Structures are given as structure tokens and as C-alpha cells.
Ligand binder design. Structure first.
Ligand SMILES: C[C@H](CCC(=O)NCCC[N+](C)(C)CCCS(=O)(=O)[O-])[C@H]1CC[C@H]2[C@@H]3[C@H](O)C[C@@H]4C[C@H](O)CC[C@]4(C)[C@H]3C[C@H](O)[C@]12C
Ligand SMILES: Nc1ncnc2c1ncn2[C@@H]1O[C@H](COP(=O)(O)OP(=O)(O)CP(=O)(O)O)[C@@H](O)[C@H]1O
Ligand SMILES: Nc1ncnc2c1ncn2[C@@H]1O[C@H](COP(=O)(O)OP(=O)(O)CP(=O)(O)O)[C@@H](O)[C@H]1O
Ligand SMILES: [Mg+2]
Ligand SMILES: [Mg+2]
Lengths: 381, 369
């Protein structure tokens, strides 16, 4: 058999949607250069397709990621179908996912920067977190089943992006970092900080080795669609078997990153979201543990409590890496880069480094999410 | 289907067909071990458990042979479909558990196994390997059925009133004390969760004294059928526990060689792992002062915790050790088995308190006086 992959265009995408049985118009609406996102109208549909390195950032990547993203979306839909787009069709060789159109929603990072507060965002994401992370763990699944899922969701290339960018590069004078010269005194203070780098190393080691559950792997505010009443998580291409606290930490850090871009009393909705997302995660995870654990140890008093404390500790450490990583690393966030005037931008970026560092160092000292919030507020006054 | 169960005649046929008298000498019912005489061993899995364990065993032995060829039997041929490994004959050696029970002291056993542990455990980790490579090895060495036996027998069944357990009734009061101990069971749960999730290196997975050939001058580790990507501390802990199990079967001053072994195996492990880390780590963090030290402390902590589960598991679970079961008279056996439970319990609960291997040894000695 011949190679089946062919790069879609707007006409090809309409032809595909028809051949698959789902007068039409199509527009390519993709935000980056690694994927095409084809919007098809009249009822609407999205066809997403991975772009191979030769035709593309980038970042040399195979189109295998499309298989991960599709399979991860489908898995999430079995547990939280109201919190992810529906998937109608997918194909590994064509590297295509056909999914629900969510054009009536706005990317959460964009809305947050515009000053939208999204009152239910943390309640929805906390539920997403609690259910996705529990139901794919050894707590919820027979170990033989979970062990096959580890193989199926092994994601070497995309893991390599996170291992480098989240956990390694910002902490050294590496080629991928990207920061203003005004920041250099403070960046160098990080590079020279042995005790924080040792802690980042341990966190990386956990990312590399702790195959606890199927994670989303890139759950930032730009990876969520939002309106006042709805929330949908997208693009689980980084999915693999990793630490439970990782997704929780990345999301929380992106909430703090937005808080930093804001001023004064405007920060309060974000601090409320940090509190609510932890609380809802913990409640959701705990309810799932109680009802659906297969573990004979699950209902011994203190075991769930200690499990949550460890997830919490790692989540805050991971949050700290993300705070740092987004500030001086290859991949930045609009929350910080669009701060004006310039000297304010530098000052707030200095604070993301300082808060990130404190999170990493003090992760095992915090007892509750409010301790984390209260420490943050003091540091950013 | 290409699989056919060998007999003594077809074993020699295979050895000749591969261009390399016969007696089946296997000490269990799941594998045939054919000795052919220059000499050769042909091990074959029999078809409850998949014959895929033979592919794991061969692959694991070969990988071990890349780093410690002097400490594992050489492999000449292997075949997944036939479930065979053709390997070096080690008939001139004795199973270390048997020798230890007979009173052999094996002066180099500790230095040899410590070297085996340091090198096998380092060189298959993320410390030594590109993460993309390690991740392929994780897939290759996934071992669901064998891992299942360990998850059940080492980490679960002894801590509850489960059907697989096997203990003398005189031991019941002390068994029920363990079952009723919430805080120890929570800690066993955490160690099981680490076994289930922490894919740190390719481990042997069943490194007890019955899995080692020994003489005065030579040591060879065998049967890595349980191999998979698991916690670095696991093999270290199981081995140490089996040294302590032999100490419990001995009396007084005759225990000293075993305590010496426990000390030397940790020391040699730590030294070997540290030397490899220093020379062969790919990690940009490797050389920050404190990171290796903290890495070792965590390995140590887990090892002690896993030693505790192995002490308990061997005493009251499905799979016993001859060290304990052959103690006479009865009443002494029961006493020594109560101590294996109490020491294993202390190891699990106190694992993060110990600062050095000496602390572990001294605590054990105190308890078993
Ligand atoms: C001062 C505010 C109280 C806010 C409020 O009351 N509103 C709070 C609430 C949580 C507190 C932190 C954690 O406890 C962890 C850690 C424990 C050490 O012991 C000392 C350092 C550190 C970072 C603590 C400092 C300070 O104490 C914090 C930030
Ligand atoms: N289901 C959907 N409904 C409506 N618009 C969608 C959509 N999926 C994607 N889009 C549009 O396409 C953009 C790109 O989506 P997505 O984040 O999946 O692409 P990407 O994977 O190429 C980005 P990255 O490289 O940062 O991960 C979105 O921000 C959105 O505007
Ligand atoms: N390389 C070798 N050289 C000489 N004898 C060997 C040998 N490998 C195995 N044997 C002999 O056969 C016995 C069974 O070997 P082994 O322990 O590998 O098998 P097994 O896997 O069937 C046991 P278990 O069921 O407990 O795991 C050994 O105790 C030893 O006496
Ligand atoms: Mg993407
Ligand atoms: Mg065996």
C-alpha cells in the first residue's frame, strides 16, 4: 500500500466532510503554523490536520501527535463530554481530527486579558481536572489495563518539548530562552541559585518517571474555550502518562500569570479562580476516589488525604516552573508580553520569576491553596 | 503456531541446530531448564502465566550483560515464539539462599550484588539515557502479568485477610495486629503506588537470594523474568530484606556476616551509582551539589520501605522463604517469624527516619535481640 497522507486545503476539507457523510463554505482559521484548522459551515464542523515539518515554530515534529490528540479527546469525552469538544471522526495516517465547532466561544486567555471574568471557569476546569486525572489512574483502572494505556499514550517528541522548555532551559543559559536585557540581572540570579535548580531537577525527574495518570500536558488558558456559562478544554496533543499534579499546576500558574497582567482589585477574580479550581479539583477527585476506587487501601483513613497533599505539593512546584518558563523561555504568554508601559512589563516579569521560584522552593510548606494565594499577593504587592 | 514444548531430545536437537547428554534440572513447574554437556543451559517457559516472560527474561539478561557481563550468565540465543533462552552453564555454583542456610558466608556476595545494583539501575535510567530512548525501553519491558503477581503478593495480600496468605495459626495474633494497623497500611499503599507508577529504571524485579548463584569468588544474578520499569529502590530493598531473613534463621554471632553484607551492599550500591552518575549522566543538573545526595536519600528511603514489605510478604504470604520455614524447633520458628513481621513493619514506618545503613542494621539488631 501507498502512503495515504495528503495535506488538506479548503476544498479537500469540504470533500472529506462530505465523503464521511457529516452547499458548504470553508475557511482555514488556525492560530499557529503546525496545524490547519478548517471551519466548515452549513450546522458547522471543525477539521484539524497536522502539518509535517517540510510544509510548516517549528520545532521539528512528526504528525503522530494527531493520533495522541484525537485519542485523548475521545477518552476525555467518555468522562466529561460537556467539557471537551465532541469528536466525530479521526484518522492517524491523514493526521486529522473532525470535531465540534466551538466558534461561539472565546479562547480563555484572550477573554481574561480583555477583562472577562468567566465566573464558572474554575468550577468547570476543577471538574475536568478531578475526573480526567482520577479515571485514568491506577486508582480507577486495573493495573494491566492502565499499563496498556501507558504504551498507547507514550509521547516522546512532545514530552521532549516540555522536558526542555518547562523543566530545563529557563534554569540555564540555553539557546531557547527569550527575555529582555532589562531582566538579565534577575535571570542570572535564577541561574546561580543551586537550591532552586535542585528542586526543578526533582520536579523534572517526576515528570520523566511518575506515570500516574493520563494528563493533558499543556493545560494553559490559551488551550480552553470559554463563555460566561460554558468551558471546553482543547488540544490534548501533549497527553501521556505523567504526574497528577502537572495539569493542575500549569492551569493554576496561568491564572496567576493573568493576575500579574492586571492591577489592584481587578486581580481578585483570578485569585478566586485559583482557590476554586483547587477546591473543586480536590472535591471532584475525592468523590471519584470514594465511589470508584478499585484499591483495597482506598478507604483507610488518611490515605486519600496524604495522596492529595502530594498532588498539591507537586502541583505548586509545577506551577512555579510554568511561571518561570512562560516569562523567560521560548514560549511566552500574551498576559505578560502585552503589559504596558515597558518598565511595568519588566517589573511584572521580575515578579513572575520571584513568585515561580518561591513556589518551587516552598511547595512542601503550604498547607492549603489559600496559603499559596496569600504568599503570592504579598510577593506581588 | 511455532511454539513446541521441548524434551531432553529436542533440547539437544535445538543446541545442534543452532551450531553451539541432557538432563532437565528445573527447580519449579513453570519452566524447563535443560543442561547439555563444554556445557549449555536451555531454559524454556511452559504454558496462570503467559510465556511472554521468556522474552522479558532474555532481553533483561542481555541488557544486564552490556554493563555487568561478569555478574550475569552470558546469553547465546533467545527466541520469543519458542519462549527459550540459551545461556551459560553455571552448574559449578550454588544458589546463594541454599549456601547461606548451610552456613556459607560468601565474602564477596555484597560487593558483587552492590556493583550489579549500582550499574544495572543507573544505566537504564533517565540519568544515563536520552528520554526518548528510555521511553521506548519502558514499552519494550512492560510486564503486566508478572507485575500483577508482585503488586498482589508483595504489596497487598499480606496486609489484609486475603486468600493467598499462608501462615501458622500461632502467628495469627501478630498477623491481626498488622491488619489492624492503619498507619502502616497507608505507608504500604504509598510504596505500592510507587511500584505501580514510578518508571525510573529497568529493574530485575525479584532479586532475592534464591535468584543468585554463588561461590566464594563468583556471583551471578539470574532469572530477571519480573523485569520492568519500576522504582530504583526496589531491587535494593528486596535483596537487603533477604539478607535480613537469613540473619533471622541464624543465631548470635553467626548473624554477623549477613549484617556485614547488608552494610556492604548499600555502601557498594551507593558508591557504584555515584561513580556512574559522575561519569555518565546526561543531565545538566547532575553536577549541582546536593542533587545526587538527595537522589540517594530518596532511593535509600524507598529501598528500606520495600525491604519491609519483603520481610512481611515472605513470612505470612503465599511465597515463603526456606530460611524461615526450616527453622527448628516450631516454637522458635514462630518467634523468628513474629520478628520478621515486626522488623518489616518498623522498616516501612520508619523508612524516612534512617540516616545511614548502619541505623537500619542497628535498629534490626535491637529488635531481634
Ligand atoms: C502572612 C500570610 C497570611 C495572610 C493572611 O492572614 N491573610 C501567609 C499565609 C501562608 C504563609 C506561608 C506558608 O505557611 C508556608 C511557609 C511556612 C513557613 O513557616 C514560613 C514561610 C511561608 C512561605 C509562609 C509565610 C506567611 O506566613 C504566609 C505567606
Ligand atoms: N473546535 C474548535 N472550534 C472553533 N474554533 C476552533 C476549534 N479548534 C480550534 N479552533 C480555532 O483554531 C485555533 C487553533 O486551535 P489549536 O489550539 O487546536 O491549534 P494549535 O494546536 O495549532 C495551537 P498550539 O501550537 O499552540 O498548540 C484556536 O485558538 C481557535 O481560534
Ligand atoms: N544458567 C544456569 N546454569 C546452571 N543451572 C541453572 C542455570 N539456570 C538455571 N539453573 C538450574 O535450574 C533451577 C531453576 O532455574 P530458575 O530459577 O532460572 O528457574 P525458574 O524461573 O523456573 C524458577 P521460579 O519459578 O522460582 O522463578 C536453578 O535453581 C538451577 O538449579
Ligand atoms: Mg497544538
Ligand atoms: Mg522464574
Amino acid at each position: 500500500k501507498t502512503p495515504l497522507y495528503e495535506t488538506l486545503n479548503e476544498s479537500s476539507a469540504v470533500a472529506l466532510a462530505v465523503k464521511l457523510g457529516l452547499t458548504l463554505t470553508c475557511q482555514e482559521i488556525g492560530d499557529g503554523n503546525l496545524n490547519y484548522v478548517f471551519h466548515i459551515y452549513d450546522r458547522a464542523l471543525i477539521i484539524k490536520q497536522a502539518v509535517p515539518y517540510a510544509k510548516v515554530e517549528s520545532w521539528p515534529l512528526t504528525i503522530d501527535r494527531a493520533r495522541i490528540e484525537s485519542s485523548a479527546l475521545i477518552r476525555q469525552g467518555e468522562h466529561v463530554p460537556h467539557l471537551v469538544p465532541r469528536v466525530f471522526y479521526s484518522d492517524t495516517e491523514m493526521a486529522v481530527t473532525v470535531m465540534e465547532d466551538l466558534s461561539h466561544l472565546k479562547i480563555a486567555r484572550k477573554g481574561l486579558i480583555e477583562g472577562e471574568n468567566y465566573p464558572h471557569l474554575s468550577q468547570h476546569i476543577g471538574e475536568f481536572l478531578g475526573k480526567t486525572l482520577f479515571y485514568s489512574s491506577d486508582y480507577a483502572l486495573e493495573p494491566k489495563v492502565k499499563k496498556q494505556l501507558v504504551k498507547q499514550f507514550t509521547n516522546p517528541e512532545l514530552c521532549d518539548i516540555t522536558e526542555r522548555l518547562v523543566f530545563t532551559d529557563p534554569f540555564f543559559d540555553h539557546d531557547t530562552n527569550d527575555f529582555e536585557e532589562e531582566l538579565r540581572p534577575f535571570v542570572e540570579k535564577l541561574w546561580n541559585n543551586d537550591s532552586v535548580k535542585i528542586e526543578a531537577a526533582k520536579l523534572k525527574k517526576s515528570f520523566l518517571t511518575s506515570a500516574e495518570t493520563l494528563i493533558h500536558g499543556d493545560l494553559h488558558t490559551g488551550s480552553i474555550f470559554a463563555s460566561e456559562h460554558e468551558t471546553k478544554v482543547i488540544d490534548p496533543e501533549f497527553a501521556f502518562y505523567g504526574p497528577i499534579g502537572f495539569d493542575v499546576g500549569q492551569f493554576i500558574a496561568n491564572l496567576f500569570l493573568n493576575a500579574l497582567s492586571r492591577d489592584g482589585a481587578d486581580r481578585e477574580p483570578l485569585y478566586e479562580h485559583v482557590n476554586q479550581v483547587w477546591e473543586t479539583f480536590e472535591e471532584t477527585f475525592s468523590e471519584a476516589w470514594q465511589k470508584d476506587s478499585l484499591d483495597v487501601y482506598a478507604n483507610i483513613d488518611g490515605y486519600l488525604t496524604d495522596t492529595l497533599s502530594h498532588i498539591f505539593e507537586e502541583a505548586i512546584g509545577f506551577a512555579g516552573c510554568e511561571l518561570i518558563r512562560r516569562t523567560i523561555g521560548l514560549a511566552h504568554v500574551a498576559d505578560l508580553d502585552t503589559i504596558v508601559p515597558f518598565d511595568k512589563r519588566i517589573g511584572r516579569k521580575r515578579l513572575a520569576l520571584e513568585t515561580g521560584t518561591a513556589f518551587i522552593e516552598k511547595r512542601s510548606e503550604f498547607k492549603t491553596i489559600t496559603d499559596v494565594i496569600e504568599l503570592f499577593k504579598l510577593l506581588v504587592k
